[model samples]
Target: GAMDPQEETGVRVELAEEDDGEKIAIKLWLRIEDIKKLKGKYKDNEAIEFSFDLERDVPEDVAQEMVESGYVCEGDHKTMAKAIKDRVSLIKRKREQR
Candidate 1:
């Protein structure tokens, strides 16, 4: 279930999960549901230091890999932060342009 991939800032990312023994398409669940944000923003090019819930499914390395492969770029914390900020800025720019 591959879609046209986007190069988000300099970090390519994809959001997907395994389903029915196959890779299924998905979206980045950008909700603050599982993550507990502490003292800073989470996006590309920003320092991220936080703990994960013990019940969380994927380890940090696996998680990074998943996004990196899908996005087709190195999806590290700093790169991801920049992509996020770019998305926000792009959206805001669109709104202002209108």
Candidate 2:
């Protein structure tokens, strides 16, 4: 059967190694709805995308936890992860403040 490109939705997070390096990175693919949100900010048909190396910011073990724990299992993984991570960070910070 022929593959359907439209079948893939939400953000796709992949962990792969960098070129000629041992560093592991995270690659993200935005959903169609995500791209639609930027329609008013940019020109016609302009593609807005985001991709950055996660190796430096996130620990390898933590990234593994995100995948293995099903934290990235939801439809909007990026948005969910951002909120959850910030919520947890704030909680931890509050505990330390007391």
Candidate 3:
């Protein structure tokens, strides 16, 4: 099926679970390098409408565990396993002092 050109596309809202028992909803626009089907969905500051499957994202608790376990990084640098480990260790140290 072809998407309507007049309709907005590639606008995603992800509802995910975190290991900290937090539920997170993330809104992200499609980049030029998304799925092939959405290649044409990228627009420059244009409003787009699209349906997304939230199930694709990891659950909150599991994702939180991944982060705490040094498996996730969400900052200027995306998740790199090594960075997660380093950051997690830093967090542990901070907690131990309190």
Best model per lDDT? 2
Error of 3 at 64 (Å): 14
TM-score order, best first, reads 1, 2, 3
Error of 3 at 80 (Å): 1.1
Per residue, candidate 3 scores C-alpha lDDT tens digits across 2-86 of: 3666423222222222113222223322222222323222334432222222344433433354346443323212322222333
How do the candidates rank by lDDT, highest first? 2, 1, 3
> In model 2, what is the error at residue 41, expressed in angstroms?
24
After superposing candidate 3, which stretches have Cα over 4 Å from the reference? 1-79
Candidate 2: Cα lDDT at 51: 39
Best by TM-score: 1
Q: Please report how far candidate 2 places residue 66 from its true position, in Å.
A: 12
2 against 3, candidate with superior lDDT: 2
Judged by TM-score relative to the true structure, which candidate is superior, 1 or 3? 1
Tens-place lDDT per residue, model 2, 1-98, is: 11766623322222232233333333333223333322222232322123334434432334344445543333334443453344334333444552
- CA lDDT of every candidate: 0.34, 0.35, 0.31
Model 1: worst 10 consecutive residues (lDDT sum) = 17-26
- Give the range where candidate 3 is weakest over 10 consecutive residues by summed lDDT: 14-23
Residue range with the least summed lDDT across 10 consecutive positions in model 2: 39-48
